Amino acid sequence: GVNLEAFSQAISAIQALRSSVSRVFDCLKDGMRNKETLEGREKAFIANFQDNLHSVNRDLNELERLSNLVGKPSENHPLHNSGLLSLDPYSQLLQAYKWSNKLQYHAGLASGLLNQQSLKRSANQMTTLVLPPQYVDDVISRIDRMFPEMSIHLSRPNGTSAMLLVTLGKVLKVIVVMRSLFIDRTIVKGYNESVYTEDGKLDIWSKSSYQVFQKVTDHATTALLHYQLPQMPDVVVRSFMTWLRSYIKLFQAPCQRCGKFLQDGLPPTWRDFRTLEA
Amino acid sequence: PHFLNTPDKSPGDRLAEICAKITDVDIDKVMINLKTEEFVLDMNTLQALQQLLQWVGDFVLYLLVSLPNQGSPLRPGHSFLRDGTSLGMLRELMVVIRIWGLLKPSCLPVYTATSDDSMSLLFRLLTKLWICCRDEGAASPASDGLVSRLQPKQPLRLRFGRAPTLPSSTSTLQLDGLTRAPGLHLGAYPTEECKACTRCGCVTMLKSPNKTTAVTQWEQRWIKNCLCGGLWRRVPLSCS
Numbered sequence A: 001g002v003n004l005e006a007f008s009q010a011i012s013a014i015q016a017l018r019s020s021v022s023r024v025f026d027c028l029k030d031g032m033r034n035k036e037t038l039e040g041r042e043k044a045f046i047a048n049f050q051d052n053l054h055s056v057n058r059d060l061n062e063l064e065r066l067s068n069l070v071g072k073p074s075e076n077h078p079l080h081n082s083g084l085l086s087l088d089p090y091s092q093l094l095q096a097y098k099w100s101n102k103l104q105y106h107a108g109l110a111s112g113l114l115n116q117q118s119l120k121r122s123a124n125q126m127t128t129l130v131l132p133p134q135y136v137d138d139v140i141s142r143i144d145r146m147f148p149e150m151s152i153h154l155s156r157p158n159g160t161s162a163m164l165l166v167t168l169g170k171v172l173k174v175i176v177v178m179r180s181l182f183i184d185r186t187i188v189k190g191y192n193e194s195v196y197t198e199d200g201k202l203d204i205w206s207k208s209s210y211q212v213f214q215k216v217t218d219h220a221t222t223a224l225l226h227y228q229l230p231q232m233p234d235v236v237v238r239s240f241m242t243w244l245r246s247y248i249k250l251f252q253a254p255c256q257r258c259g260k261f262l263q264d265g266l267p268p269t270w271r272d273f274r275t276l277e278a
Numbered sequence B: 001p002h003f004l005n006t007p008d009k010s011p012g013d014r015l016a017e018i019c020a021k022i023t024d025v026d027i028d029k030v031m032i033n034l035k036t037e038e039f040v041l042d043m044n045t046l047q048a049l050q051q052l053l054q055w056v057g058d059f060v061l062y063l064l065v066s067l068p069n070q071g072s073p074l075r076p077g078h079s080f081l082r083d084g085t086s087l088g089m090l091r092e093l094m095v096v097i098r099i100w101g102l103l104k105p106s107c108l109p110v111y112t113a114t115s116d117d118s119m120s121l122l123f124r125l126l127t128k129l130w131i132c133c134r135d136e137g138a139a140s141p142a143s144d145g146l147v148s149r150l151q152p153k154q155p156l157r158l159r160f161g162r163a164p165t166l167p168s169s170t171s172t173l174q175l176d177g178l179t180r181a182p183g184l185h186l187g188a189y190p191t192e193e194c195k196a197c198t199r200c201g202c203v204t205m206l207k208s209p210n211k212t213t214a215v216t217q218w219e220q221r222w223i224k225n226c227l228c229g230g231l232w233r234r235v236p237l238s239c240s
Helices: A004-028 A040-064 A091-113 A136-145 A214-226 A233-245 B012-020 B027-034 B049-066 B085-103 B118-133 B143-147 B216-221
Strands: A152-154 A162-166 A174-178 A186-188
Touching: A004 A040, A136 A152, A136 A233, A186 A214, A214 A233, B012 B027, B012 B085, B027 B085, B027 B118, B049 B085, B049 B118, B085 B118, B118 B143
Parallel strands: none
Antiparallel strands: A152 A162, A162 A174, A174 A186
């Protein structure tokens, strides 16, 4: 697994294991300059001694470590070394192996700091923001279905615009009827109250529920109207899907008791809590 | 003359002075060759060797490493000490502290390694350079190359007492009342101050009460003005 990175911290740990004892003897390198207030200075010595206990903690750190070992030792890395002398002038690639990573890592910061944009204007510098091809919808559908344990379906019986339905662990399916590219004008229900497979005769609208999911529907509409980025509609629908995923539990109830109202949910901050409080 | 020994043909210090007429190496031989018994004074002598006498030991060590430094940008470098007479006096000091350590195990060894008696080899190299420089000798013999070897025993960071001066050459020296502008070895010298530490300007840098029980010899011997000791000053410790 990825627990190997934990060993990195362990490295720093044993580093202190050295420094600690140095900080001990350095503290013994000189005596009382001028206490004049108390004799805790000597205790200060023992204070450094206390940090030596940290070393024992290092031994404890190995209890959580050693999850399991992976097969095929050496992880296909030194296979290039098995080549003849002709292959040895190849380490460069391995360097790039880190470099590329750094690249990503650099972007990992850069893109992050790209969040604070400076686009004083976005028009009068040019188009067709509505996606022409009726194939990018299927692309977005497949990208969403790439997510596990969350099934998505779509029929689009109305026309050019997009129509889709999504289901989760509960029967709280969500019907989203939006334009070509970005999600807008959706609704949610629960327990066959919509039944948008063959409701009456087709995927009906019915604009209703028993006064429980209505707040969730309004919040999802707000999230759709708020996450409408100027570009990258795929990012928009992915953010929408991630937001929708946050209701798969409906179990916790922080910053209040589980008796304030019918339910509780408003996670635009990537964390749900008691509703009617933000 | 600090020996309460038993009398003999001549004085103890006087008879010790003639040690010059002795072989080069193996001080352990010459010590019993002159006299061994009448040199102990009392049990309460275990305060000088491990505390203050160690200096002289380190002293001779500081000579060795400083021996091959003629090419340095200083003709005598740190020091030269090629007098011989004073060197003979120091060699007598070495043999008497050797018989002292023979009388008590709390002497000043090399403190580092090769104890199974570095002092013996140190002393023999010193006597070698002595006899090589006693009566108008050479300086840098082939022996110089071999004694120049750095044994893993030499310590560093010695005081080498000194003081500033007044280099007011010709024109002007303006100072304030305070905040000067730039331009006894019985231990008693830690990193930070630990007592009143009444010091002096010549070389002393010592403590005020000497913090001892029966070492009053040195303390009483230096309560008054020390070597040009008009500069017996005092200053408190710093506070944060």
